[PDB]
Structure formats: structure tokens, C-alpha cells
Design a protein around this ligand. Structure first.
Ligand SMILES: C[S@@+](CC[C@H](N)C(=O)[O-])C[C@H]1O[C@@H](n2cnc3c(N)ncnc32)[C@H](O)[C@@H]1O
Ligand SMILES: C[S@@+](CC[C@H](N)C(=O)[O-])C[C@H]1O[C@@H](n2cnc3c(N)ncnc32)[C@H](O)[C@@H]1O
Ligand SMILES: [Mg+2]
Ligand SMILES: [Mg+2]
Ligand SMILES: [Mg+2]
Ligand SMILES: [Mg+2]
Lengths: 386, 386
């Protein structure tokens, strides 16, 4: 039994991702001065403007406007024709303090270990032995394509690339076989890439460049064949991009940020939120759990759900599903027992263990939060479980 | 083997849902005058303001500001102490035309049947025989709780309820047994409800009211027991709410809008988008497919994934998973063949079949898009398949 499944990714300059990056830049700016900051920083953008809005309670003295401009500059939006110019855009800041009624049930008069969850909600973690990163192949491939475009554009290369503009998206469809719940990729069925460009590069040149310098660099040659459908810039023209073509908002790429359609999602955004927002910290710990179970060889694929209630430290529920892939002797009931001996989903413990009051978040806000090798993403360093 | 699983919902007055409703109010306003409108209307809110932004190409003459104010008024935000006052708030409108490069690959010089998808992306549909609505019980229960609060507050009741303010959230955890992929609810494990209120009603009164007039009205008594954990207003005070406590944005309740963590999600928001945005139309058709397969008795649970590329009419991939619950004689390969004989995922066909150019969308923007009985949601009227 074969089946097709698709996942997507977007470039750093995609307007929604731009907002995620600004929100996390602001979070990091607050945390570097005040690790105790409460941050719920939303960003939105359209032609010629960015607005930051939400709730921050911090002792940090942050020039929010400069943080926004520097972030946009670093992404490469330095000219109106690219879709946004950090020099000329309007930046609007509409921040207030966190509600005292929310603060009162999170930290006020509570031991650090027993701080309340910042909200209700559910979070999922997922892992799969398909890739070295323990991530789904469709997601790994789509993400690699956009990450490679961003590297080519931003870090720079010796070749002529000044035609590449910041916006872009990719989507990869893989044909799989499923054996006992274990996912075995057979072949790549379709690769779609849309990249923003300037007005003088040929479509044929764009296509040759993306195929040779991106797709063939990041997609395994043994999964591509004559029938793999390659769709590069199917719209035929993509020169107007960024906020100039499409509004952006924080937390509108939650599936790109996680598992690409695999596993599940509880609905909460990550970027712009300090770690007392369990949307973020709960999902990061759930990833560590799933990844640790797979890394330990106890199953081939694993889904974890945790849930919380506002002002309540301990999770309201925990769930583990190994899709029938558990190792002989193990099952989901036993695995939950193992998880409970090892892990503690109280946010105060979570935060300490994963160093989530340090200014580590801007790096997570493009490229996916999971399956990452950066030493500081502690949720990606698996624990050996037995 | 038992397990716990949670889903959540939010009230109509939740700031994110408020934005979804405004975005869809604007969409409907455009469609009622101009069915051919291209709409990508985002909304955001914080204390004392709403901003609408994005891209609309329409022949309609819409007073966007009046639409926003009327929508907020209808939700009940008519006083600063409730969290927002439609009379006094600033309303900012930052709309531009749709990019011609996007328009050019969607409809320009194309037959109506072969219009291109408005973007790339993936969409999932899901159905399960757990409930009459063919929706997951956790989602049905959480949604019913918030829908009941909204009905009590907005339509009104003979009892004293003027203490109920517009914001609120609920979360329900169900303990399940799983037999051959079929989900059998055993009991309700936890019910969490947070409701905004004014300054004179007792916590004990709120709790008694929610338990007796909401929870016991919508949750089956035979799934509740002495060990069911009832958590009503655990923060102890929730008087400051709405945009005054928490920023809202369109498309930040995508899991509340769909299946509550069950099935899967492709990442796209629904509200504010016309039906050429396959994030919406593709998901609606995928729901009809899943629901039709379950309704037809061909399986107990069904997940559908479709994917698209920008400017391309036909889907790039289609996937059906019945979780091992297919009826004797059927399997996922055969079911995909049946789906292909019956359904056509080209957006132009989708749109015609589901009447998606009519102003039907404001109703979808609170209460979940799926599992709804309203006659006009054609994606909820199953097709008999064999
Ligand atoms: C298609 S737009 C979203 C729909 C849009 N808001 C509208 O008004 O129809 C989403 C994304 O597609 C990409 N995009 C924009 N212009 C494009 C083009 N000309 N060709 C291909 N992709 C494009 C950008 O990454 C953009 O953020
Ligand atoms: C907790 S807030 C989100 C986090 C918030 N942005 C912050 O600054 O910490 C999310 C939602 O929780 C709900 N909420 C707000 N105040 C609350 C309270 N005092 N008790 C319980 N829930 C509350 C509202 O529905 C609100 O939209
Ligand atoms: Mg978007
Ligand atoms: Mg949430
Ligand atoms: Mg929100
Ligand atoms: Mg999308």
C-alpha cells in the first residue's frame, strides 16, 4: 500500500515568517536584559509598515522600533522593490503590560517549580525515524529547500544571485510505503518551489538555478526519478513579493514551524511568547519526549499530547501514541510510565531544564523549531530511555 | 488500552475569534455585492482598536469601518469595561488590491473550471463516527460549551446573566478506548471552563451556573462521574478580557476551527479568504469527502489530505487514511478510487459545487467550520458512496 503526502515551507522573507522573526527578536531583546520578562508580542505587516502589538511586562529597556528595523534589515528588505524597506517603512508600537489577572495565577505567590501555566491549551510533540533529525521526510525536504535559498541569498555566494529576492515557498510530496506503522519513503513525487526574483532573470535561468543549486543539493538523488514532477515558479512571474503582495502576521505558519502536517498541532503559535506560554514550552518538551522515545529505539514513530489549564502547574493530561511501532516488550501504557519517571511537565521545571529564559528564540523563528542541530535547542538533545 | 485526549474551544468574544468574525463579515459584505471578489482580509486587535489589512479586489462598495463596528456591536463589545467598545474604538483600514501577478495565474485567461489554485498548500479533512455530527467527541464537547455560553449571553435568557462578559474558553479531556482504530469514548476525564464576568458575581455562583446551565446541558450525563475533574474559572478572577487583556489576530484559532487536534491541519487560516484560496475551499471539500466516506459506512474514521500549487487547477496530491477501520472489501486504495470517480478537487468545480461565492462565511467564523447543521454549509451534507 503506497500513498502520497505533502509538506511545505517558506523563506525567511515570507511576510508571515518575517512577523515571527520580529516577534522573537523582541522576545530575545527583552530576555537578554530581563530573563523574567512576560512577553506576548504579535507582529503584522502590509505594504510599507510593521505593527508590533500585545503585552510585555519587562524591566528591559528595549528600543522596539530599532529592533524591528534591524531585523528587517538582516532579512534583506532594504528596498521597496524587494517588498519592504526597513529604512522607509512605518513602525507602529502598541504594547501594554500583561494583565494582572493573568500574572496573578501564573507567578504571584507561587514557588518557581509550581508556577501556573500561562494559559489553557494542548501541545503535541512528534518524532519519526525517517531522517537523521527524527523528522518527517516531506518536512525535512521542503524546509531544506527554503533554508538553502535563504543561505544562498543572505550569506551569499560567489555566483550571480542578486536577482533573488527574499520571499519564497516550497512544497514536497513524497510517495511512501507503510509497514506496521513504520513510514518508508519510496520516492519524491512532486517538488514545487516559488521564488521571488527581479525583473531581468529568465524563468529558464531561475528553473535551472533552483534545480541544480537547490533541489539537487538537498534532495537525495535516489529518491528522484524521471516521473518526479518538478514545478519551479509555475506562476511564471514572482517579482512583487513580501508585504507588498501579501499581509503577514505572527503565528500563521504553525505547521511549517512544527511537523508539516504529520503528528498533530494543538493550535498555538510559538513566536513572540515567553516560556510561561505553554503553547511554546509544552510543545518543546513534548518534542523532546517524542524524540527521546524514538532515539532510544523504543519505537519508530511517536506522538505526544500534553494539555494545560490556566494557572495550573501540572498538566491536565498526557498522551503517547506509537502508531503500533513500539519495540517488543513495550507499549504505549508502559511508555507513558517511562515518560512520567523521567520528565516533569510543570512549566517551572520545563523552563529550567530547557533554559527557556535565555535569549535563544530568534534562531527558532525560521527554519522550523524542530529537527535542528543548534547546540542551544535543548529540546533536540535526546535522553536515553529504557 | 485507554488514553486521554484533549480539545479546546473559545467564545465568540475571544479576541482571535473576534478577528475571524470581522474578516468574514468583510468577505460576506464583498460577496453579497460582487460574487467575483478576491478577498484576503486580515484583522487584528488590541485595547481600543481594530485594524483590517490585506488585499481585496472587488466591485463592491463596502463601508469597511461600519462593517467592523456592526460586527463588534453584535458580539456584545459595547463598553470599555467588557474589553472593547464598538462606539469608541479606533478602526484602521489598510487594504490594497490583490497582486496582479497572483491574479494572473488564478483566473486571467482561464476557463472557470480550470482556474488556478490561489496558492500552494495542503489541507486536511476528517470525520469520525463518535458523534452524530461525525466529529471527535472532545471537539464537540468543548465547542458546545462555548457555543452555549455565547447563546446564553447573546440571544439572552430569562435568568440574571448580565454578569457574563464576551470572552471565554473551554477545554475537554476524554478518556478513550481504541478498538481496531475505532475510537470509543469511555468517560469525560476533565472539563475546564474560563468565562469572563463582571465584578459582582461570586466565583461560587459562576461555578454553579456553568456546571448546571452549561456543562450538564451539553455533556452526556453517562460520561461524567465522581472522578471527572471540573475546573471552572481556576484563575479565580476573569473580569478584564477581550482585546484589553490579549491581542487578537485572524487565523490564530485554526485547530478550534477544525478538529481539535484530531486528524491533521495543513496550516492555513479560513477566515477573510474567498474561495479561490484553497486553504479554505480545499479543506471544506476534504471535509465533505471524509464525512461522506464515514456516513456511507465504508469506515469509522477517515483522514483526507489534498495539496495544491499556485496557479495550478488540479491538486498535486490526494491521500486517504482510514486508520484500519475500512469496511470488509474496502481499503484506502479502493476508497481513493471511489473518491476520484465522485469528486473533482479543481477549485473552479469545488467553488460551484459548494456555492462558495455566496455570502455564507460569517456563520462559519465562530462555532467551528465543521460538524455544523446549517443548511447552507454544503460540505456537511454527505454523499452516499459505494
Ligand atoms: C499567494 S499569497 C496569498 C494570497 C494573497 N493574499 C492574495 O491576495 O491572493 C501567499 C504567498 O504566495 C507567495 N507569492 C506572492 N506572489 C506570488 C507570485 N507572483 N507567484 C508565486 N507565489 C507568490 C508569497 O510567498 C506570498 O506570501
Ligand atoms: C491567557 S491569554 C494569552 C496570554 C496573554 N497574551 C499574556 O499576556 O500572558 C489568552 C486568553 O486567556 C483568556 N483570559 C484572559 N484573562 C484571563 C483570566 N483572568 N483568567 C482566565 N482566562 C483569561 C482570554 O480568553 C484570553 O484571550
Ligand atoms: Mg499567510
Ligand atoms: Mg491558544
Ligand atoms: Mg491568541
Ligand atoms: Mg498557507
Amino acid at each position: 500500500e503506497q500513498f502520497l503526502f505533502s509538506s511545505e515551507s517558506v523563506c525567511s522573507g515570507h511576510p508571515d515568517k518575517l512577523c515571527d522573526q520580529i516577534s522573537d527578536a523582541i522576545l530575545d531583546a527583552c530576555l537578554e536584559q530581563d530573563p523574567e520578562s512576560f512577553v506576548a508580542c504579535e507582529t503584522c505587516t502590509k505594504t510599507g509598515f510593521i505593527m508590533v502589538f500585545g503585552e510585555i511586562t519587562t524591566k528591559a529597556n528595549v528600543n522596539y522600533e530599532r529592533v524591528v528595523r534591524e531585523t528587517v534589515k538582516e532579512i534583506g528588505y532594504d528596498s521597496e522593490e524587494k517588498g519592504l524597506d526597513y529604512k522607509t517603512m512605518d513602525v507602529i508600537i502598541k504594547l501594554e503590560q500583561q494583565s494582572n489577572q493573568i500574572a496573578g495565577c501564573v507567578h504571584v505567590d507561587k514557588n518557581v517549580e509550581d508556577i501556573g501555566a500561562g494559559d489553557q491549551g494542548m501541545m503535541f510533540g512528534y518524532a519519526t525515524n525517517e531522517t537523521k533529525e527524527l523528522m518527517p521526510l516531506t518536512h525535512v525536504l521542503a524546509t531544506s529547500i527554503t533554508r538553502e535559498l535563504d543561505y544562498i541569498r543572505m550569506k551569499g555566494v560567489s555566483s550571480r544571485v542578486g536577482w533573488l529576492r527574499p520571499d519564497g515557498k516550497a512544497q514536497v510530496t513524497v510517495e511512501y510505503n507503510c509497514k506496521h506503522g513504520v513510514l518508508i519513503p519510496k520516492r519524491i513525487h512532486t517538488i514545487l518551489v516559488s521564488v521571488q526574483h527581479d525583473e531581468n532573470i529568465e524563468n529558464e535561468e531561475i528553473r535551472e538555478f533552483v534545480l541544480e543549486n537547490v533541489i539537487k543539493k538537498v534532495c537525495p538523488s535516489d529518491l528522484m526519478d524521471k516521473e518526479t514532477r518538478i514545478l519551479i515558479n509555475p506562476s511564471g512571474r514572482f517579482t512583487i513579493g513580501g508585504p507588498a503582495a501579501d499581509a503577514g502576521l505572527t503565528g500563521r505558519k504553525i505547521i511549517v514551524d512544527t511537523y508539516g502536517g504529520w503528528g498533530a498541532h494543538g493550535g498555538g503559535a510559538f513566536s513572540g511568547k515567553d516560556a510561561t506560554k505553554v503553547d511554546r514550552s509544552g510543545a518543546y518538551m513534548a518534542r523532546l519526549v517524542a524524540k527521546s522515545i524514538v532515539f532510544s529505539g523504543l519505537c519508530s514513530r511517536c506522538l505526544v499530547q500534553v494539555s494545560y489549564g490556566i494557572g495550573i502547574a501540572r498538566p491536565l493530561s498526557l498522551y503517547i501514541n506509537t502508531f503500533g511501532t513500539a519495540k517488543d516488550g513495550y507499549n504505549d501504557t508502559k511508555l507513558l510510565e517511562i515518560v512520567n519517571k523521567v520528565f516533569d511537565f510543570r512549566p517551572g521545571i520545563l523552563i529550567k531544564q530547557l533554559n527557556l529564559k535565555s535569549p535563544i528564540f530568534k534562531k527558532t523563528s525560521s527554519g522550523g523549531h524542530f529537527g535542528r542541530s543548534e547546540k542551544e535547542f535543548l529540546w533536540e538533545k535526546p535522553i536515553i530511555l529504557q
